[PDB]
Amino acid sequence: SSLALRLVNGGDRCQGRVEVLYRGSWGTVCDDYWDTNDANVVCRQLGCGWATSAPGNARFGQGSGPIVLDDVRCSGHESYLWSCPHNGWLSHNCGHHEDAGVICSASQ
Ligand SMILES: [Cl-]
Ligand SMILES: [Cl-]
């Protein structure tokens, strides 16, 4: 019940670097696999419309928190990003240069 998602460093609630609250801390999501299915789940869960793009490679900067998720492979209609298939939690397989991001339609 404590899980939560936000976008940061994008200048709007509805675009930016994806962060998930896990074990007390906001962590980032590695783009080792990242796509618009994943972005659409994020955009929907936040009430931000639909994804227009899903930029990886720390486009919205590198987080400082733990990298909590990687290999996230949503189908696209999941209600929460954590409900999508993913490679457990806290894999330590990535660096922050791979932090994933989203741009949603509701961004202004
Ligand atoms: Cl929000
Ligand atoms: Cl947790």
Which ligand is nearest the CA of 26, by number? 2
Which ligand is nearest the CA of 82, by number? 2
Residues with CB under 5 A from ligand 2 (ion): 23
Distance 41 CA to ligand 2 centre (A): 19
Tokens standing for 70? 């990687």
Torsion of CA 91, 97, 98, 99, to 10 degrees: 90
Query: Which of 10, 1, 2, 3 minimizes the C-alpha distance to 106?
Result: 10
Tokens standing for 96? 């922050």
Tokens standing for 11? 């200048």
- The answer as to whether 14 is a domain residue is yes
Resolution, in Å, please?
1.5
Contacts for 48 with CB less than 8 Å, ≥ 6 apart? 7, 13, 14, 42, 104, 105, 106, 107
Which ligand is nearest the CA of 10, by number? 1
Contact 42, 18 (CB under 8 A): yes
Strand-pair partners of 51 = 104
Number of domains in the chain: 1
- What technique was this entry resolved by? X-ray
Residue 23, domain CATH: 3.10.250.10
- The answer as to whether 58 is a domain residue is yes
- The answer as to whether 81 is a domain residue is yes
Strand-pair partners of 13 = none
Is the Cα torsion angle 92, 96, 98, 102 positive or negative in sign?
positive
| Domain that residue 79 falls in | 5-103
Strand-pair partners of 15 = 12, 103
- The answer as to whether 26 is a domain residue is yes
